[PDB]
Amino acid sequence: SIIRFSVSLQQNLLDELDNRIIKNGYSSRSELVRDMIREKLVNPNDESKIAVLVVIYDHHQRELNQRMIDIQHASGTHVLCTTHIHMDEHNCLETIILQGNSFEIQRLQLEIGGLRGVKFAKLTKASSFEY
C-alpha cells in the first residue's frame, strides 16, 4: 500500500527539481521523486581502498579551508594529496586523494559535505581488485 513520508531539500536543489518536473512533464514533486527512487533502487568493509573526493565550496566562507584541513588531518584515512583551484570568484574546486576503509572514507565525505559553504562532496572509490 501507499505511504507518505517527508523529504527536506536545500533551496537550490528544490528549484532544480521543480524545473525538471516542468521540463519533463511530471505532475508533482512526489511523482518525480518516486520515479527517481524507484530508478535508483535498480558494501562497507575494513579493506583499504583508494578514493577521490571532489569538493566545490564557497570561496568567501571564512575558516572553511582550516576546518577541512583539520578534518583531513584528524581523519583515520590517509590523505595523500589535496589540490585546489578557483572556478570563479564565488567557488573553488578541490580534489582530495586518499586511502582508507569504507567506514573511514564515508565519514570523511559526510563530515566535509556537511560543512557550511560546501556545495557538495562527491566520492569516487576504486578497490584493489578493480584495477
- 78 has binding-site annotation: no
From the list a second copy, Ni ion, none, pick the one residue 11 interacts with, judged by a Cβ distance below 5 to 8 Å according to partner type.
a second copy
How far apart (Å, rounded) are the C-alpha atoms in residues 86 and 110?
A: 23
How far apart (Å, rounded) are the C-alpha atoms in residues 97 and 81?
A: 5
Partners of 81 in the beta sheet? 97
Q: Does 64 bind Ni ion (CB under 5 A)?
A: no
Which residue of 49, 92, 100, 104 would you call a contact of a second copy, by CB under 8 A?
A: 92
Q: Does 69 bind a second copy (CB under 8 A)?
A: yes
From the list Ni ion, a second copy, none, pick the one residue 81 interacts with, judged by a Cβ distance below 5 to 8 Å according to partner type.
a second copy
Q: Does 21 bind a second copy (CB under 8 A)?
A: no
**Phi and psi, residue 50, nearest 5°:** -90, 140
How far apart (Å, rounded) are the C-alpha atoms in residues 25 and 60?
A: 38
